[PDB]
């Protein structure tokens, strides 16, 4: 009487009565004479809340009826798109075969349920699995004249599973209940997406702390390294997820792991100006002088992003102010290249050499004059930058500015007493450079001077 009433409640969608019956002690896996349990009956009638509740109460997801039909089979035949979506989210086998060889895709295709067919295909439903008679979903769709279903089946072909794995979706939503059901079914928390990321990577990207804790408590690799070398700690540090970074460090995340381009988590934190994360990583032993493939240290990335406070913190932690990349660019060179005069001010106040030479002899003043960064130029010249420094080619800052046609730079350089008659390795003056590029205004100011 209790089991019969529970199954009637499941069919009718009376979730309160069914829940009361389950509380009393009715077996949740009880089924009727046809082998339909509560999940089957709820899936037939589209009772989404009932399906979700019964899954939460640990109903066996792949239980089959006397004809071999799982709940997904019944939802597909009944055309219950919401139920099909929910069952697939909780780990329903989309390629399950009934006793007569029918798959959920076949049942959806024969009944002209276009949305179900589309969703099943996007979830890796194999449209080549035939029945015992040898018929495919395409064959039955053609026989029944379901033109839209046939067209979609032909067009999709074998594009495969283009949806994320269910556990990745659960991680994105911080859905601990769905994740718990999925991990009860499939004990592998490190399931892989096509792109190679685990659900922990997704949880770290969105700072979904609850699902991350569940995944790590169920054996997820805190240090999982895809081909690109992006660990969960890298993602957390890049995204500025302070609490996620703390959690991952507590559970054994490696501080010194390198991506494919040799970025450490500190590189990712500094690049996006995450001061608190940078401090946490440094306090956990992150190497402040680690270098990328191009020889960039975290201070270089902080300067590149105009992250003034991150630069301040890195300098406070004994970062090398005059560290050089493979191109011999110092953080001051980077700040001049990007026009970040605040970073340049902090660097020069801390003792950065204003006349550092890059590979081609360019000083920070040369770079600032090239890029028309007048504020960086005034800061450099006010903090002891040589106004007549030459590159390997003999180019002065005035040469560079005249060639680029940056009138304010040329004006300021000439006002501060820059000789316009200097010459290059080829005996070419700033006036030659202005003429070559056709910068009439710069040439006019040069000629109105003693050029």
């Amino acid at each position: 009487d209790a089991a019969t009433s529970f199954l009637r409640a499941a069919r009718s969608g009376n979730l309160d009565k069914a829940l009361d019956h389950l509380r009393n002690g009715v077996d949740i896996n009880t089924c009727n004479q046809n082998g339909l349990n509560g999940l089957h009956l709820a899936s037939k009638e589209g009772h989404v809340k009932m399906v979700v509740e019964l899954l939460h109460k640990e109903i066996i997801l792949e239980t089959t009826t006397k004809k071999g039909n799982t709940a997904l089979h019944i939802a597909a035949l009944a055309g219950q798109d919401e139920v099909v979506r929910e069952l697939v989210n909780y780990g329903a086998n989309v390629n399950a075969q009934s006793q007569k060889g029918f798959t959920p895709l076949y049942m959806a295709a024969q009944e002209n349920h276009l949305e179900v067919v589309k969703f099943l295909l996007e979830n890796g439903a194999n449209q080549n699995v035939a029945t015992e008679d040898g018929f495919t979903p395409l064959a039955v769709a053609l026989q029944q004249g379901h033109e839209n279903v046939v067209a979609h089946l032909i067009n999709y072909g074998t594009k495969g599973k283009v949806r994320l794995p269910a556990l990745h979706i659960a991680a994105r939503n911080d859905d601990t209940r769905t994740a718990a059901v999925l991990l009860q079914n499939d004990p592998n928390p490190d399931v892989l997406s096509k792109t190679g990321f685990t659900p922990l990577h997704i949880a770290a990207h969105y700072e979904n702390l609850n699902v991350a804790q569940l995944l790590l408590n169920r054996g997820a690799s805190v240090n999982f390294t895809p081909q690109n070398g992006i660990t969960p700690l890298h993602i957390a540090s890049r995204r500025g997820n302070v609490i996620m970074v703390r959690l991952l460090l507590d559970r054994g995340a490696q501080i010194e792991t390198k991506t494919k381009d040799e970025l450490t988590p500190l590189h990712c934190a500094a690049r996006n100006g995450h001061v608190r994360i940078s401090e946490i990583l440094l306090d956990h032993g992150a190497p402040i002088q680690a270098k990328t493939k191009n020889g960039l240290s975290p201070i270089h990335m902080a300067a590149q992003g105009d992250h003034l406070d991150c630069v301040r913190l890195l300098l406070q932690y004994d970062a090398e102010i005059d560290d050089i990349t493979l191109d011999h660019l110092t953080p001051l060179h980077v700040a001049a290249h990007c026009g970040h005069h605040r970073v340049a001010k902090v660097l020069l106040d801390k003792g950065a050499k204003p006349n550092s030479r890059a590979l081609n002899g360019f000083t920070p003043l040369h770079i600032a004059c090239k890029k028309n960064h007048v504020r960086v130029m005034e800061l450099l010249l006010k903090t002891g930058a040589s106004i007549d420094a030459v590159t390997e080619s003999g180019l002065t800052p005035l040469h560079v500015a005249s060639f680029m046609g940056h009138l304010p730079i040329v004006k300021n350089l000439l006002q501060r007493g820059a000789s316009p008659n200097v010459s290059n390795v080829k005996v070419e003056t700033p006036l030659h450079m202005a003429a070559r590029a056709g910068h009439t205004e710069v040439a006019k100011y040069l000629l109105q001077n003693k050029a």
Binding site: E122, K161, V162, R163, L164, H168, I169, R172, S193, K194, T195, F197, H201, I202, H205, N228, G229, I230, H234, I235, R238, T259, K260, D261, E262, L263, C268, R271, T292, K293, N294, L296, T325, L326, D327, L329, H337, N360, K370, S393, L395, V400, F403, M404
Partner: protein, 32 residues
């Protein structure tokens, strides 16, 4: 809408693999 993130391509774009790479150290040689 509200379900694009469930798909592999959208998730790839959201995770931004390019942001974990050293793009380049541009020089823009003045001569030519």
């Amino acid at each position: 809408e509200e379900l694009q993130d469930d798909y592999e391509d959208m998730m790839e774009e959201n995770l931004e693999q390019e942001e974990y790479e050293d793009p380049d150290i541009p020089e823009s040689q003045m001569e030519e």
